[PDB]
Amino acid sequence: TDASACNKCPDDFWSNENHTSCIAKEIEFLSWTEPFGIALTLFAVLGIFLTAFVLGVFIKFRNTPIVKATNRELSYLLLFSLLCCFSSSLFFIGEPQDWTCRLRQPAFGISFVLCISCILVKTNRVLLVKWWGLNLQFLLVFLCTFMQIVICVIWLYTAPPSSYRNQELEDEIIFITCHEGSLMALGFLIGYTCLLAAICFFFAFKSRKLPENFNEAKFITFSMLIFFIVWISFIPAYASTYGKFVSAVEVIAILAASFGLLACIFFNKIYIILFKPSRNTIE
């Protein structure tokens, strides 16, 4: 009743509206059961469903030689990489726990490298530019992936990411974010991925007019251009958001890049294998 001086509320706590009691601040963070979160995870699971449906189509018509002209075995690895890339989007929408922050970026990175490098190796005109005949493309793509695995492991060992609990932005609201520690290793990761994608884009830019399996080399170019557009428009969109809608933009870019890589590159085959021009496939 008779207080000579009000005492400050402790950490993770705030005064009530009438300054009588103390209540805790809020754990604002992107999650499900939100008008933004539910639509986003719906898009992610839709991407997974489409990718799995395309994989099932490629398995069903596995003996038709439409798919046999582009390293059919490697296509399954590409589709699994697409599965993993789509799934990596669900890491940014969950609770930013300790393990989530240490893996959300490396997982999507390994997925996307296992995807772009697989596409780049897939080119049947570049496989030949005695450990070949049984497994030659797999080793070449695995070296490129392995480079990224080791840079990821050195980043995860030296300066592991941490779940930074930040409350400086809002005095009354606690924002659960993720800290990376050393940003130079993440910059190296992004630069290596972009360099691999640019190499794929350059290699596909010289074979646009060659109709190798339904003008596939042109759609490699289209997918790479979509990826570059997405990740160059993500730069201003990311350094503008302050709050819960900051893990919702990199995930949007991930969804856009994965859609551009999957639809543009596989729907050519899909619209001929099972659609009305079913009797248009030929060797």
Ligand X SMILES: *[C@@H]1O[C@H](CO)[C@@H](O)[C@H](O)[C@H]1NC(C)=O
By CB under 6 A, name the binding residues for ligand X. 16-18, 20
Q: Do residues 270 and 54 touch, judged by C-beta distance below 8 A?
A: yes
Chain residues 251-270 in contact with ligand CLR, contact rule CB under 6 A: 263-264, 267-268
- Residue 167: closest CA among 24, 35, 37: 24
Choose from ligand CLR, ligand YP4, a copy of itself, none: what does 268 bind? Cβ within 5-8 Å by kind: ligand CLR
List the end-to-end C-alpha distance of the chain, in Å, as a whole number: 90
Q: Which of 81, 193, 221, 258 binds ligand YP4 (CB under 6 A)?
A: 193
Q: Do residues 139 and 112 touch, judged by C-beta distance below 8 A?
A: no
Print burial letters for 25-64: b (CB count within 10 Å at least 16), e (below 16): beeebbbeeeeebeebbebbeebbebbeebbebbeebeeb
Number of residues located near ligand YP4, criterion CB under 6 A: 17
Q: Toward a copy of itself, which CB reaches closer, 36 or 49?
A: 36
Number of residues located near ligand CLR, criterion CB under 6 A: 5
Q: Toward ligand X, which CB reaches closer, 16 or 97?
A: 16
Q: Toward ligand YP4, which CB reaches closer, 74 or 103?
A: 103
Q: Does 186 bind ligand YP4 (CB under 6 A)?
A: yes
Q: Which of 174, 220, 252, 262 binds a copy of itself (CB under 8 A)?
A: 252
Q: Toward ligand X, which CB reaches closer, 1 or 18?
A: 18
Residue 162 is given by DSSP the state B
Query: How far is residue 8's CA from residue 28's CA, in Å, rounded to a whole number?
Result: 22
- Residue 101: closest CA among 41, 26, 160: 160
Complete DSSP assignment for 221-266? HHHHHHHHHHHHHHHHHHTT--SSTTTTTHHHHHHHHHHHHHHHHH
Q: How far is the CB of 223 from a copy of itself (least distance, A)?
A: 11
Question: Please, where are the H alpha helices in 90-182?
Answer: 98-122, 137-158
Q: Does 202 bind ligand YP4 (CB under 6 A)?
A: no
Q: Which of 271, 276, 278, 283 binds ligand CLR (CB under 6 A)?
A: 271
Q: Toward a copy of itself, which CB reaches closer, 148 or 223?
A: 223
Q: Which residue is nearest to ligand YP4 (CB)?
A: 231
Q: Does 44 bind a copy of itself (CB under 8 A)?
A: no
Residues that bind ligand CLR (CB under 6 A): 263-264, 267-268, 271
